[PDB]
Amino acid sequence: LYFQSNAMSYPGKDKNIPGRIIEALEDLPLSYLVPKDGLAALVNAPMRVSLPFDKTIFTSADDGRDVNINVSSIKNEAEKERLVFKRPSNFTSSNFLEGLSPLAQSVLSTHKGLNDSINIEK
Amino acid sequence: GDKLSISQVYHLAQEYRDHAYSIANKIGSEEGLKQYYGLMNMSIQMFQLLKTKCTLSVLEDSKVTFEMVELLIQETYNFDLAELYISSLKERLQTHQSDTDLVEEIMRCEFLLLHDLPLMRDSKFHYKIALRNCNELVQYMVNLQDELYQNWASVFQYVGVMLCIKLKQHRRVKTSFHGLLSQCREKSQWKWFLNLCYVNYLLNERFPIPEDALQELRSTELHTVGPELYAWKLALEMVIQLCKDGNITDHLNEFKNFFDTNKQSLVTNEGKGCVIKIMPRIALKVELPMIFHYKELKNILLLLQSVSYIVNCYDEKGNFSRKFLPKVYSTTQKLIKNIAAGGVSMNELDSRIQTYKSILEFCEFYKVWEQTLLKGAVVLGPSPGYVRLLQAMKVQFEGGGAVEEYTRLAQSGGTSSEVKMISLLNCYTVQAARVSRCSGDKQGELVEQCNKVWLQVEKLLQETDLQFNPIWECTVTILWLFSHFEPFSWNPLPCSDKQRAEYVSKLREFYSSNKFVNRFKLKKALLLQILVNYLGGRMLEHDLGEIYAISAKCFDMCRQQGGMRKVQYVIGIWHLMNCTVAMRGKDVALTNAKLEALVKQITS
């Protein structure tokens, strides 16, 4: 087919330069297509839906019940009961007993051996 | 032996827990982490003490078990243990259910079993069990004519939907949402909440949003739904405009008015979340701290606004992004630094920080993206495929073609369809450019690839909302016409006369709406605006005066961004012809000069 452009001469026509628009786009990403992935999810998370259960218990002053309080490395089913706490991805900051009641402090100290807590990653 | 009263043990379990929450934002070392979990350990053990060493009533057993299991779920990986406690509790409650009001407790057992535990597990195997049992539960409850069980059945229908989403059963999700929504009371907080979940899910997947869901979203009433959920409505309406590249001015003004009148509501309500009272004794608490907290919300809105202006790039809108993405970044840094208790798990704060970090990653990513648009060069990874996309574009910029880079990115399973499609379109452009300039020998291997890549573009486009995005729809039309018509290609691909008229007709719509002097309206994406006017000017305009004015404008427009020299050169050839035909001597001289200048730059 005939077009005036390719017929007539002009600067660069003999050089290695794109003379038609599609060839000009070979080394030009369509960057005006700005990706938006993750933005909707950002609105959607973090999200929690829960069922609040507000019911007071152990209110009867006459209640006489009391409590006796003095109480592996291989793949096992017993490790279902052994507590494994979650290693967090981050530190929330860049003495934690302060503020605890004396009784809470006392029970905590008496049972310090049981505090060999295991913290693990997913 | 050492003894404490039953209430003293119970309150100690609470004290240890609540004190851990009080310092949850102060863990800066291993020592602090040991102390935090040391407290949680004691709290759990004290709870276990009650269950094993005391005779608890059903209500006492319920309360203790729930508080304890709440910690197992949020603080530990002991999900099987948690499940055993709830399952045990459930069976005990059922034994007394006849002569004791225990429905609330039983339904909470089911919620923990079917919603909380599976979500924390995040295991496909357990999701299938949960979904199976959840559907069984719903089927059983809808058969009860009682209003309480009918409402509870609605809650667990919603749980089922959430389980379908996690299992990526997208057809089931849509079916379940529709069935769920259709049974809800119209113009209720509950229905409008579920519809927001629906719209957000669709946007996350970039699925087309049905009209009824759209109208349901717009009809959402602030005073019925509350300021927290309405902020979510407004946010989603912003994302919708962003995804379709629509105008956000109206939607910005709505947020403005909302803040003026409901700022105080969000600030005074901060932390307490959103409580949806479905029924008396059926209350759902909803937490969305990024949207429900005033500072966090504005931060998100500023991000969305800035992202929407990226494509504008060089003008005043672009300058906004370059100015305020840094603000979003710095604000986010402070939100991380000044994160507070409470009284929520350290792990809740941990997840919020992780989201904050993703926002930082978005700021950096879009900074680089806007610079790439501006300069025509590449110098994060908040979403899948973003890093290697920028790397692929870098190769293409360097004349490396980047077919293999784009192809591999379009084939990876973790990447969004949007990224896949950008990769396929760039890949098509490269291959089509090669069909044009390559000899007849390699023409065989290049045209099939064009046809192959193109069908892939059509397939993905047809199952995303991008098919309703004018920038995207126009890009498709432009690229098809460029590859099927001279003088836009030397070797145009074969096509029927019906196909030509089809795409030419699409062009006419975009060009008549975006000609250098209605959802065919294109944002001022520089490269796009030039190509549409170039294509329209070449194919649709007959008048010499009009053709000259358009070619002149196209020619000059190219200067606004880097990387546009070869495009400008081709445009320059066209403009030179129009000058030559019009016999405009001065304009021929200047245009030839500009072409000479472009040749010297390009051939460096």
Author numbering:
A (entry chain B): -6 to 64, 73 to 95, 105 to 132
B (entry chain A): 5 to 383, 390 to 527, 536 to 622
What does the primary publication say about this deposited structure?
We obtained crystals of full-length Scc4 in complex with an N-terminal, 181-residue fragment of Scc2. We used an incomplete model, built into a 2.8 Å resolution map, to obtain phase information by molecular replacement for diffraction data from crystals of a native protein complex, extending to a minimum Bragg spacing of 2.1 Å. Scc4 is a superhelical array of 13 TPR modules with a beta ribbon insertion between repeats 6 and 7. Repeat 8, which has a particularly long first helix, lacks a second helix and has instead an extended segment with a disordered surface loop. This irregularity divides the solenoid into two subdomains, TPRN (Scc41–384) and TPRC (Scc4391–624). Residues 10–50 of Scc2 snake along the continuous inner cavity of Scc4 and emerge at both ends, with the N-terminus of Scc2 close to the C-terminus of Scc4. First, the concave surface of Scc4 is entirely enclosed, and Scc2 dissociation would therefore require either unfolding or proteolysis of Scc2 or Scc4. Second, residues 58–132 of Scc2 extend beyond the axial groove and make extensive contact with the external surface of Scc4. Several Scc2–Scc4 contacts on the external face of Scc4 are also conserved, including Scc2F86, which stacks onto Scc4Y40-Y41, and Scc2112–120, which forms a helix that fits over a hydrophobic surface on Scc4 TPRN. Mapping Scc4 sequence conservation onto our structure revealed a cluster of extremely conserved, solvent-facing residues, some of them invariant among all eukaryotes we examined. We found unaccounted-for electron density in this patch, into which we modeled a sulfate group.
